[PDB]
Amino acid sequence: VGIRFCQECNNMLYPKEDKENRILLYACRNCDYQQEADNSCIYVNKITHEVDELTQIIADVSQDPTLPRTEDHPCQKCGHKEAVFFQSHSARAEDAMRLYYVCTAPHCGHRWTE
Template identity: 35%
Template sequence: MEFCPTCGNMLQYEMRIPARFFCRTCPYVCPLLPKVSIRRGVQLENKEPTPIAVGEKSVGPTTDAPCPKCSHGKAAFHQMQTRSADEPMTIFYKCLNHSCGHQWRED
């Protein structure tokens, strides 16, 4: 869509030779060239993905949630919408005890 630089209304397209855009409100007319010119944009570069977790180290937030398997008091968590939008989010936990690493969820 193109808009009139004078009054801001949407321009109408008219197929005639040469084709043109025109404004129904004011006398603005923009003739279209018969040739199309392609402008080259900026070249995109491949980027390395950013790691979310490095090794055993958890990047996410932690909370005081007891593990149901080993009763360790700290766990990392993240939330995700697994059901419809009017339902609460599901919380996924991972025990921060290195020998346990148990994962569980709360619906």
Template identity: 30%
Template sequence: MLYFCPTCTNLLIVEEGSQGMRFSCVTCAYIFPIKRCVSYKIYPKLKALDDVLGGAAAWKNVDAIDEPCPKCTHPRAYFMQVQTRSADEPMTVFYKCCSPTCGHRWKE
């Protein structure tokens, strides 16, 4: 967490004082004693792979190819290519099983 001086708006630094730890300003004489430890972590929720690829609508107008599903061995799968890495790397191919009961997704 960053705290700023209410007097001169400079960033406060943490230092050890005579009564313990405190925030102090290097520009003016402002001092704020630290009475308790305040810390917490917030982890952002990662997006699902479908959201990154364009959601459910991304699979509407894709082509099918003769690629067997590794889960149900259905002979055909939908596919799309997405550039997931830098431009000098090959595109990543994403597959979705054509079987309506399976719908397994994998990538190459």
């Protein structure tokens, strides 16, 4: 999944298999350093790309004057009544009108979707 950069040359490590030991080794082409791979996964592609946008949402968006705010939905973490609510705001979000609520009030930074 994640890309690992070699210490010796600070370049990308590409997967390689040692036939003798049948052990996956991440080896740079430019330098001879080789590292055993713990993950054992080379390439992962999510065609559905069903990735939650809750992680992508920033807590700073609560300060926006233009965003609508609801006191009807209380915050789960701290119980603050106000919570700005906005849609996906994302391209390639397929067809979702879910409201990604963000708790207002300083430093709570809680994002929940109902």
